[model samples]
Target: MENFQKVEKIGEGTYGVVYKARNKLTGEVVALKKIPSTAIREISLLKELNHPNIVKLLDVIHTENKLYLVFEFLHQDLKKFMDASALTGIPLPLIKSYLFQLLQGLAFCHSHRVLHRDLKPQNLLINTEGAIKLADFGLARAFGVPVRTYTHEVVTLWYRAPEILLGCKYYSTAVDIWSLGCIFAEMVTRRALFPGDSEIDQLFRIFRTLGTPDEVVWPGVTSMPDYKPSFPKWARQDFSKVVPPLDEDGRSLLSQMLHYDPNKRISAKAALAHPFFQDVTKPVPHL
Candidate 1:
């Protein structure tokens, strides 16, 4: 605790206000996220994870009853990054490059049996270095065994998977895949793919795109606790048409990632090699 000195405030988050600081012993810079205790879950889950695509938890300072989680200081979160990107008319190949990096981090987490229940632009950190790392694991979980309990209320509404919104009793890594799908589309459209007003509106908006789910496309869908008998049904929409510049390859992966059936949804690892990313080589630097 005495080895570090707080310098400047970064931003406040759902959990705490983050600040940038310097290490007295090494002259190194770091970000200090004050946790003001489910942080135990975050600390334990992150301790076991180490990947270039994952935010590094440099150290944990416990003193004076305030738990300080020290992390590598990066640039800005994706939400702000994209806001500035909107200044550019169409954006560019940069989307593909960063999306690939994001998937790599997600694949690493999924392979480790961890579910980043929360996935959104706000949680992704990006900088001029062109590196995109996954952050904010406060709502994340490591589902080691098949019998572990899963809460339905995990992800943010805009990026939440269909299964969770449906109150499905069973869910898995596919949950994170759907969330990434929403995020993937956001990068392309520069807006939320499904901006639902409430839990019910979320499903309505989703149903409008993929069409209302049933036992055919999604087996046991009707058995879910939230399934309703009388709901408006909208015809399925084309992913490519939703956002023109995304092209067919990107649209294909978007469909696979956003598949209604959680079991059938694409895994982050499998998504890394999707044809959409085949030709994307570098983070074409621009606005």
Candidate 2:
């Protein structure tokens, strides 16, 4: 911890407060996670991740009472980056590149049997080079391919999955897929697709907007613990109406990612091969 100089706190970042710091000797920049000495889940999984699109954890400093986890620093996150272009929306190609990189990062995670239970604009860190890296592995639940029950406490209200909202205990990687789909739409409009205030409100906004799921569309959904048959019914809204800039190709891929059935939701590997990215020139920095 003594080898680096703290620049400033970075928005009370995930799991614990994060500080932007620079190496005292090398002059290189980094982000430090200031957390209690008891936390180890973040480190156990983080040390194994070796992907370009995933943030690199460089050092772990153990001060007597506190633990400092150092990571490569990226100046911008997806939220601020999108906010900077709040006018006519970000360039489609750049958006395409960012989305592709996010999927590739997630694909690597799912392949390695890890779930980024919390994914949103803020957790996706971006560098000046335009490369996107997945951050915040503190909530990372490493579950192998075999289905297992997970804690209900995960994901923010905005990007929370439908099954998760319905109190489904046995969730899979599809939860992250749902969150990524929300991020994709947000890139188009620079606003959350479903901005609900509470868990109930969140479920309401999702159903009302995406069209309430039923046994017909999503088999066995009514069996979920939180399912209520008496709720008001509403037809799904058109994607083009909500995201006017999205074309047929973009809408098609987004549809699969947001599929009501987790089994039917597009995998990250498949999403990378979708038509949307077929013509998109990969962002060199994104690579």
Candidate 3:
């Protein structure tokens, strides 16, 4: 604590308060999270992450009973950025750029066999230069290798994949893709794609837009423990109506991501190569 000075409180994190701080010697500003033993998981996972689009963990300081993590300070989260913008939604070019970086981060995580179980606007950090980074790892986990069962209770309710809500414990990378689709829609429309207040309402909101799934659409729909046979059937709505400002290519890519069948959903790598992002996929310098 003597080595750095706290500039201000950034926000509350999973375990404690996050602060903007400056290294007294180097005069470098960074974000710091004060953590206790219960938040150890986030510390370990963030330590292993290294990517231009993933927030970098600079250093760690351990005291008697607490841990302080230092990260490169970003200007704001995507939610606040969107809220501060004019009603028409972020400029298309900037949206494409942010989305490309997001998918790149997700692709890197998937390649490393890690899953960012929680992905939402609030967890996406951005800088004044328009660079976007995926932050927060409290709900993240490493997968692959010897298969293991995981708790289905992960991901924020709004960004959660339908399979997870249906109690599918054997899910895979596709869950992140679903969350990516929701984020993309929100970026375009400047509002949540499915703003449900409860688990049941969430499922219905998803079904209402994508249409209620069945055996043909989602192969194992009837088998999941939480599957509700009584769920009302709904016809899929037009993408144009849902996100009117999005172009055709953008809509196509989003449709692939939101597919009911996890196996059918686009992977982060594949999504990065989608036509919707073709213009913004070129390599860019790091901040």
Poorest stretch of ten by lDDT in candidate 3: 142-151
lDDT of 2 at 147: 21
State the weakest 10-residue window (summed lDDT) of model 2.
143-152
Q: Tell me how many clashing residue pairs each candidate has.
A: 0, 0, 0
Q: State TM-scores per candidate.
A: 0.88, 0.88, 0.87
Candidate 3 RMSD computed on C-alpha atoms after optimal superposition onto the true structure: 5.3
The candidate, 1 or 2, that scores higher on lDDT is 2
- At residue 227, candidate 2 shows an lDDT of 92
lDDT of 3 by residue, 1-287 (tens): 89899899888765457899899989999999775454465556668778999988787677887777788888888888888774656877888898888888999988977777767888899876668998864334422111222223333478889998898877888888898899889988888999877789999999999999999988989889899788899999999999887999999999999999999999999998888876773333233
* lDDT tens per residue, model 2, 1-287: 77888899876643457889989989998888775323455566577777999888887676686667888888888888778777767788888988998999999988987787778898898876778899864344432221222322333578888998898877888888999999989999888999987888998898898898988889999889999998778899988887777999999999999999999999999999998888876554322
Error of 2 at 165 (Å): 0.9
lDDT (C-alpha) at residue 44 in model 1: 62
Clashing residue pairs in candidate 3 are none
| Candidate 1 ranges with C-alpha deviation above 4 Å | 36-42, 142-155
**After superposition, which runs of candidate 2 have C-alpha atoms over 4 Å from their true positions?**
36-42, 138-155, 283-287
- Could you report the Cα RMSD, in angstroms, for every candidate shown? 4.6, 4.9, 5.3
